[PDB]
Subunit: 122 residues, 6 copies
């Protein structure tokens, strides 16, 4: 049976001037800008590396256009260290998303800036 592609990205979070900075690294340790092109059905797995000392945990992935069909589903691990996106790459187009995280310093949710997902169907 046919298998898609699994992409793996680390979401490193540091503090600069007291506020979070999101740095994505790829499977080669390279800092990457964060946008992703999806060229066939598959998954995107994000691992949190929280270096802020603010107790960050993922609570989900947010979208200003959540019904656009670019991302089919979001899954989250029980410890808030992993989120995975399912992208079946049938609907062509682009969508902006932001990571949503809790923190242990206060009761505000933390939002990343928004990368883009770009779907290029087969």
């Amino acid at each position: 049976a046919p298998q898609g592609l699994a992409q793996f990205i680390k979401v490193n979070v540091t503090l600069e001037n007291g506020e979070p900075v999101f740095i994505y690294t790829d499977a080669n340790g390279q800092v990457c800008q964060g946008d992703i092109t999806v060229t066939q059905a598959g998954t995107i797995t994000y691992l949190l590396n929280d270096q802020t000392l603010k107790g960050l945990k993922f609570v989900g992935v947010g979208f200003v256009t959540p019904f656009d069909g670019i991302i089919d589903a979001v899954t989250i691990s029980s410890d808030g260290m992993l989120v995975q996106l399912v992208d079946l790459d049938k609907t062509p187009g682009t969508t902006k998303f932001q990571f949503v995280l809790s923190n242990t310093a206060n009761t505000l949710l933390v939002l990343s800036p928004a990368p883009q997902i770009i779907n290029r169907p087969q």
Copy 2:
């Protein structure tokens, strides 16, 4: 003992072209742009009026600069229909925030565009 100000805003959510649109209304039914100036300690209470048929519920309020001290705390009701912000208005400045909501159509979180809170301390 001294009492602050309680502001009340309705967060109306409709769908246009299949995607959510956030319309804030004030205590007089007037559509307001959404930014808020806080001029003394108090609270901001947001009531959800979901007209999307997508089962929206608040899950919190997100911030790209969550440690800036403009908003002290966020509280949420058990039904996801209300969120309240505590703003003690000691730290002057401005912050951008986005509502974070779940929906019953898919597993993506929904983000509003970002209003600003502006603190003007006494």
Copy 3:
């Protein structure tokens, strides 16, 4: 647009003879008896100061007559340190409530004794 009043009360919890004692303090540090008169629409914000070493967290606010309309809604912060009441002060009358808290020593919920809210509509 019209703004209500925001009241702020600290819920200090100590142990005496091994059991919790609830002491409310107002915005001037004064110990207050705990009952509140509401004279216009607004909010009541309760901040937990747990000095018991029993890991108390708010889980909500309970009522023996929960459908009486005196309190419209309860919101809670993710860390269990804040609860807020919405009181629109349309329904005149009085209601008794008790704080409900979890603790880390055992699996029993902790209840405060019951203050009263008294609504005096405009």
Copy 4:
């Protein structure tokens, strides 16, 4: 190995004058007043029969003196229809408790009036 006693009580909840009324029934269908004497180690199982149309669910059992040792633990089912108390009946004495329930009409927790548990150790 030695076995304790398992008691079973139904917590029937009706509305009278728009507000909840708690009626306990025993294993013979008899209305009982609600206080329980425990004369050896065992469990007390409470089954909710909600006839209010307000969507009641147990969320726990609350105590004003939660560290008194009369009740050792509370367990709850995932549907909120059952709560069980563990009473090892080593500590003699009495304690007052109140059921704590959520409802689907509003975000206030519902509290029962308080029965007593009376421990008479072997």
Copy 5:
């Protein structure tokens, strides 16, 4: 009114060769094999003694034949240290179950091997 039997079993969990081993002990400290015969209506209370250093907590009790009527309900404590089974012992027969636990080392759930419950109605 008629009272059933309350059975109490400790679920001791150790690590051998890096993996969990479940050892049940009865009310006399005796290691028992784990299967239980139920001869009248009652409850079975399982207390977790986690000696693995892996932060185990019960999250429930699982069944491959969950609709067979042998066990009527499962309740769980808020700290994950206790699970209780309600067995009304009307339906005669046997069922296999496995404890389900979370752990703090990873995001996989932990399953015990399966004991049997055997119902012998009165």
Copy 6:
């Protein structure tokens, strides 16, 4: 940067003789036996197709040997319709797992029979 393989399996659940039966189908609609061989790093995405009318939802994936390193992580969607496994395929070997699901008919968790994951590292 290097990309792994994403496998997609549907977990169809029917009732036969009142009890759940798990039928896995692959990306071609073929019924498959359920065991999976993993030959490089990647993900396994399981979509629930519940045809039981018992309101099944995934709550996680359980393991009798959860620290064996074959599966690195489990993620779950908010609606309980998807679970995903991360398998980095560094640790060679095999592990047995069972799906864990809640249901709306009773408070017992539902367990599948156990497929195997077999890791063959590159």
